[PDB]
């Protein structure tokens, strides 16, 4: 029962462009055990129709998952990934930055 905390990357499927439809990804990895809650946020609010990949893991046995949904970047809408896991004191929020 060693406990490993998740790395998080938030990013778009295609280069972002205000007003053009896209996919928002939250890729979580390097964590253990597998139970984990991932949400995609819009202005702090919970996007409902979010899908995710079948659990898998790396050579060091730590897990990874992709969560994703459809979205449209805009000038004023704020997007983030909110992740909670047993090894985390508080649910970590990671903002979408279109340069990353």
């Amino acid at each position: 029962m060693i406990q490993r905390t998740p790395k998080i990357q938030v990013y778009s499927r295609h280069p972002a462009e205000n007003g053009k439809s896209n996919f928002l990804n939250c890729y979580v990895s390097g964590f253990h055990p597998s139970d984990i809650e991932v949400d995609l946020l819009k202005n702090g609010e919970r996007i409902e129709k979010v899908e995710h990949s079948d659990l898998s893991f790396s050579k060091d046995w730590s897990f990874y998952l992709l969560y994703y949904t459809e979205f449209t970047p805009t000038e004023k809408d704020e997007y983030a990934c909110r992740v909670n896991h047993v090894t985390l004191s508080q649910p970590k929020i990671v903002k979408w930055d279109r340069d990353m």
């Binding site: 029962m1 060693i2 490993r4 790395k7 990357q9 990013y11 499927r13 295609h14 280069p15 996919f23 990804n25 890729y27 990895s29 253990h32 055990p33 597998s34 139970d35 990949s53 079948d54 659990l55 898998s56 893991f57 046995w61 730590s62 897990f63 992709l66 994703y68 340069d99 990353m100």
Partner: protein, 276 residues
Amino acid sequence: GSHSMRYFFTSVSRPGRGEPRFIAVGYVDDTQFVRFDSDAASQRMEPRAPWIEQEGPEYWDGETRKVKAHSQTHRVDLGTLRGYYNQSEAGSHTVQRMYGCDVGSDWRFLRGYHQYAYDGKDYIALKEDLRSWTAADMAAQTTKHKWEAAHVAEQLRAYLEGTCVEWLRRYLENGKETLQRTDAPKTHMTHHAVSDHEATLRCWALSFYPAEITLTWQRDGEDQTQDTELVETRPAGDGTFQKWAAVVVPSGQEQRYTCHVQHEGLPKPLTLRWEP
């Protein structure tokens, strides 16, 4: 190029009531093509790639039957490991198994592997000669003794060297339009001020397959790792992958630095410079 076929199984026990949660996924190179989830409705091996849909009902009946046998094995393992380690029926525990075969450019056997983990640490693995076992602790040494007496490694070697490789060729041929194509990274370079004295250069690699890639920064033709950040390769979600590498430099000295990109899909490494 070289190719591999690999299978990943995860079983997570549920205290209080019922069976463990079990998930299985299968890969050719970096393409998922099959899955099973004990919580989904079908209770069958399901396809995840078009070139595997063409296989007939006999295949899907066999795969489903075998994957449910795998799930029942992990159900028993979790029970027995709890016994070996003298743990309570109250906690939640994980078993993970992974195995597969690599072929070379000639598509002949290069290597096979089979490893097992409990609670996220090495438990028992098959050695590279496919003839004996690596046991991490005394619980696993007891398993090593069960398996040498039942000649599991011999049984396992037939599969890896034989059956595993045969079907890998078959998959490579039917998915050849996808599995045998390389997609070269689309690369560009962006620029972000980080103060009045500093600037970030971010070198991007998009839409590439397979996922192995190398991005490196140079300054005046010499390697540079100070003040560089390199993110883990990540999936785009459409089957391809992404990566970027960044360097912080002094404003006005952007031209001294070059980004270099190596990938199977590129006949030569690419070179990138910043341009105003």
